[PDB]
User: Fold Prostaglandin G/H synthase 2 from Homo sapiens.
Amino acid sequence: KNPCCSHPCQNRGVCMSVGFDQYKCDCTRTGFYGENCSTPEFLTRIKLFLKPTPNTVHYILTHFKGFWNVVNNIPFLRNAIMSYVLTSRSHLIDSPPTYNADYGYKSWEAFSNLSYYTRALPPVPDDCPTPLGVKGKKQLPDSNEIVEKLLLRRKFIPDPQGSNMMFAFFAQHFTHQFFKTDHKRGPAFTNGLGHGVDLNHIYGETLARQRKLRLFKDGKMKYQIIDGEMYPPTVKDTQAEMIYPPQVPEHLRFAVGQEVFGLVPGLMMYATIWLREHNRVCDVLKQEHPEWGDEQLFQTSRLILIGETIKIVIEDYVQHLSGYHFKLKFDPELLFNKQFQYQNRIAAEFNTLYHWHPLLPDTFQIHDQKYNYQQFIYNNSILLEHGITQFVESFTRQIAGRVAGGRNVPPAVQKVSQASIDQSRQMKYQSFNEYRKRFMLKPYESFEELTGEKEMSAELEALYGDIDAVELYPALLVEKPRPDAIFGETMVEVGAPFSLKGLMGNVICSPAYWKPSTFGGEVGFQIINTASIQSLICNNVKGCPFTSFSVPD
Amino acid sequence: KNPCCSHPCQNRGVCMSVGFDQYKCDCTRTGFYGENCSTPEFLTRIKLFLKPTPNTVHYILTHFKGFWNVVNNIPFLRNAIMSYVLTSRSHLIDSPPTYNADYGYKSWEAFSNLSYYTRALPPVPDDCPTPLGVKGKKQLPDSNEIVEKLLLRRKFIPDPQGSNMMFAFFAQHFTHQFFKTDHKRGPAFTNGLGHGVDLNHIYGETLARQRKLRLFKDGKMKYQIIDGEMYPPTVKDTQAEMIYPPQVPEHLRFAVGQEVFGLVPGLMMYATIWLREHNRVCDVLKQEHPEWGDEQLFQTSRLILIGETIKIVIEDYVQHLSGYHFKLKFDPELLFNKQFQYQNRIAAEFNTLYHWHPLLPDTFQIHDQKYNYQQFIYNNSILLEHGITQFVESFTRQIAGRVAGGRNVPPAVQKVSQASIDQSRQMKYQSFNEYRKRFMLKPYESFEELTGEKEMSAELEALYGDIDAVELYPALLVEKPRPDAIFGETMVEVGAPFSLKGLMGNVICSPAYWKPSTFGGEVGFQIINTASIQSLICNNVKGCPFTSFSVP
Ligand SMILES: *[C@@H]1O[C@H](CO)[C@@H](O[C@@H]2O[C@H](CO)[C@@H](O[C@H]3O[C@H](CO)[C@@H](O[C@H]4O[C@H](CO)[C@@H](O)[C@H](O)[C@@H]4O)[C@H](O)[C@@H]3O)[C@H](O)[C@H]2NC(C)=O)[C@H](O)[C@H]1NC(C)=O
Ligand code: COH
Ligand code: COH
Ligand SMILES: *[C@@H]1O[C@H](CO)[C@@H](O[C@@H]2O[C@H](CO)[C@@H](O[C@H]3O[C@H](CO)[C@@H](O)[C@H](O)[C@@H]3O)[C@H](O)[C@H]2NC(C)=O)[C@H](O)[C@H]1NC(C)=O
Ligand SMILES: CCCCCCCCO[C@@H]1O[C@H](CO)[C@@H](O)[C@H](O)[C@H]1O
Ligand SMILES: *[C@@H]1O[C@H](CO)[C@@H](O)[C@H](O)[C@H]1NC(C)=O
Ligand SMILES: *[C@@H]1O[C@H](CO)[C@@H](O)[C@H](O)[C@H]1NC(C)=O
Ligand SMILES: *[C@@H]1O[C@H](CO)[C@@H](O)[C@H](O)[C@H]1NC(C)=O
Ligand SMILES: O=C(O)c1ccccc1O
Ligand SMILES: O=C(O)c1ccccc1O
Assistant:
């Protein structure tokens, strides 16, 4: 019935019903006119003709290494390039945010209610001819059949880019401070009201929890000392609730900022390292400020660690997955002369696309031991047996799975993968092709074009019938990867805007915050601008083991 | 003992303690350098030497009537001028926000906790030589003594700008959506978590309260018809709680968004009027969109009303207030090629400077009747007796009191005035002069310079001893008014940045929102862009009485 069900408005124009039988497109500031915002005004024809395709730009960034080695070493060029990267990427994000699961039109409820994920595309209206709008069959395919035929791993497919378990667990640990789906009320809702990198997965989401985890001496967080090494405190000692199955003995019930980080020893590894880092920075600041009290020591350490996080994400983590010969830079000053909003709201689609379960290995190799999922899960004694050093050394050397390219989701997390499909349907996601359009990509014209292959594409056809009916999550995981890359085109072109906006949008990157006095002075400031994944481990892990997000060659 | 107690860092530098006896100034992006951020850069001392005083800028805007009168009618020039007015003001506001009453250094707790008012200036550190830091006497003067000698009305002083009761109640009604002090917690905390113009004083602060006030038909808000006229619903009906004394009977306990608007019939008047406007807009939107449901009709009406509010506040309210010949313009597009943050956090100091009690008259005159405070307070019964039309006609013609110049606070609200001073001290406000500097104003060199007068300046020296020890709130009320103006310069040069930032920083003013589809098409969009205080009354008040913010 609803005339906007066909999504007729192109190029980010806004659809609106005008009576029962008609719609109107609001083309305001799209760069297009016409009844569907599909006629480029003169200046847009210029930009469009000159705009190089993402696969073209990816090629340039991933070749000509000698050229990039020069660019990387003349700050003016490196600054200029990193700047354009930042501004052109984040330009694709609505800020202040707009839609959520319950509102396909602008509303104060959608704007102001922080309990919702925001939405990059509005939900499909409730009464449309087909679940995605007007394209596809009256009912979407069985999600289980989708997972089995297209997603489930037959043979482990290693990541060609060489991503390891340090990468995989960093990704899980980092993103779960802002992907905290509140399933008690629905997939549309989040428990992370900071909607960004606030490090609540270390410090706790609420003040009450933070007070349970803090030592209230020297700004430090509570800990226990096992084998001369520092670990998180217990649930018993903190009264900070955690999710642990009954059979987990209480001395192994570690208490950390995020309730679920006891699920995997890989997560508890990072929680332990970051906890050490907090108390390390406390020691540094106390030496620099012996007049300071516990509260200021705590708050300043937190701000610094937020800065470390952001620095490491851009210059080690995003750097790794990009494959760029160009050296990414964390530098808030790049935006001080640019139009940029220092705020962000976590999008549900960003959550969906970050469901990188194919990364997970068939078993976890630590030292000379292999653990299946039954053995690894909720087993902190594994962490204690080997220690963090061995954990880093092993995880640095174990390869992760390729995310794109299909058929690499471990059967152990089958239902998780199916849930991603089901929940996206509950939240009335639009199609994969609509999301490509939303981020200035050409929609795929056929199933074979999407996969670059004849087998899986054929399965997609028999299930979906129309290429415009393929859903966001499955299509991201079966898309043709870029040459020897972990991801396909759409993952990166949709992902990076969400990510870079979230990172640079952080309040500490704003002019009023980005100054030495915010971080306790010059020494504190320096801790941020010299941070790396290697330094994070070297400072907090015994023996200073080598580490990296890729397996050594 | 705190080295930063003297507020050594000038020009918005950041003080930090380095050891028990030493400090360091962070002069980053101040445009200054040196130990105390006192020495200007070349670029800045040039910009400094050629930037005119606000008193000069004020004169220019308040004279040359003939010149401005043609400027107002050339859209290009009006836009350019309005564009600068916006950008210069707002740049004085830290955004994203920084300090609050509990944090004199930047912290995640200060940034993220919305239950606090933010602070334009950090609190005086606890362990300090004097309550204000370093200057002044060991103990501040008795707050009641300040009120009595300097603030209490001895004889009504009318506003020379002619502000009326329509103005005074608009001011109170509009600001009390974002000045909602959580007194149970402390003066440092707010119940207005939206921190701006969200019209929670109409729709309620929470979804739960909103659903008690809504009708869930045609997007409308609940109401009752009394003597053929639309009035807010009751507490009995909505179950939305209100603050009323037991003396008020059930049928007179009107329920509106803001819990305290039962206190004053002038507030309930505006509540009623804005209620009617909402339902009026629903009717318009329904004619345009027969296909729309109740929920979309409600939300779109709300967005439109937010727009009407910002429009009316800038082009009528701040316009009257300013006394400018230039016609201020509400136009979000003026900022689309400027750097500007569409976010805001309500400053405690913004709350304090808005304590404009001297506006209040000796009595309230509705038609042939006069009511003292005791009779007027919580009296919905006399709202029904006269009706909104009569309320508007009367309020338009009754003059308000002058806010600056001292000694014009109604004795009836004496202890409110004292509470304003006490709460300032509880929140550890810095001195008036520090706040002058904070907003790029020359500090006052003497008491006499502050009042331009001999008698009150003498009392201030007896009480405070040092000009650098005078507190923000009393100084604002005794400051030498601008000529024939309601305010002195400090009220304006501090208040306008808070105010314009919070107006233009509203989400509907952002590029993603400022478009006709947001408001249901051009018909809805046009409701915003042609709204005024006179049209708001003509549309929703029987008889379409003339109305203004100044007396006829
Ligand atoms: C952000 O959006 C969320 C999703 O809409 C909001 O969560 C929802 O909040 C509502 C309202 O608090 C809650 O509904 C409530 O329904 C009952 C009435 O509708 C209420 O019980 C009432 O019983 C009597 C009337 O029925 C009345 O006399 C009594 O005083 C109660 O008022 C019941 O307790 C229930 O809580 C939804 O359950 C909730 N939904 C979800 C999925 O969480 C959230 O509030 C929004 N946040 C903000 C700040 O507005
Ligand atoms: C790199 C990303 C990554 C990794 C490595 C990872 C590794 C692992 C892992 C390793 C041993 C296990 C047992 C799980 C198991 C789960 N994951 Co992930 N997950 C990841 C990204 C996500 C995200 C993102 C969500 C949903 C976020 C939310 O809303 O809470 C998720 C959801 C889940 C859920 C809840 C289902 C749902 O929210 O729909 C389970 C259970 N999973 N995952
Ligand atoms: C802006 C103009 C204005 C007007 C016209 C006005 C008119 C009136 C009025 C009759 C019309 C009465 C009976 C009062 C009485 C009060 N006002 Co005002 N007030 C005004 C501005 C304010 C502000 C601002 C606050 C503090 C708001 C907050 O924190 O909630 C305030 C606070 C109060 C308080 C709270 C006391 C405290 O602890 O601070 C009382 C009582 N008053 N006021
Ligand atoms: C914003 O900051 C507020 C001020 O710190 C904070 O309010 C404080 O909240 C804590 C909750 O942990 C309360 O702590 C006490 O609460 C009860 C009752 O006493 C006890 O069971 C606790 O153990 C503890 O003693 C404080 O009373 C409360 N303080 C005030 C002045 O309200 C808010 O919680 C902060 N907001 C957010 C979102 O974190
Ligand atoms: C309502 C009157 C105030 C009562 C409190 C008395 C405090 C001292 O009030 C005195 O009042 C005089 C009136 O013109 C002033 O000239 C004096 O300067 C003032 O100190
Ligand atoms: C957890 O790991 C320990 C070894 O560290 C092992 O002995 C134990 O059986 C494991 N728990 C399981 C497999 O449930
Ligand atoms: C800086 O301020 C301090 C405040 O005590 C003052 O004593 C000192 O002379 C000033 N120094 C300079 C270089 O301005
Ligand atoms: C309101 O009306 C008159 C004022 O003259 C007074 O007699 C009456 O008691 C007042 N009622 C309330 C509830 O204040
Ligand atoms: O930064 C990216 O390129 C990116 C892409 C996809 C998902 C998460 C990401 O950080
Ligand atoms: O708009 C102003 O100039 C102003 C000044 C002081 C207080 C509130 C205000 O809106």
In short: Residues 294-322 of chain B form the longest helix (29 residues). The first strand of chain B starts at residue 14 and ends at 17.
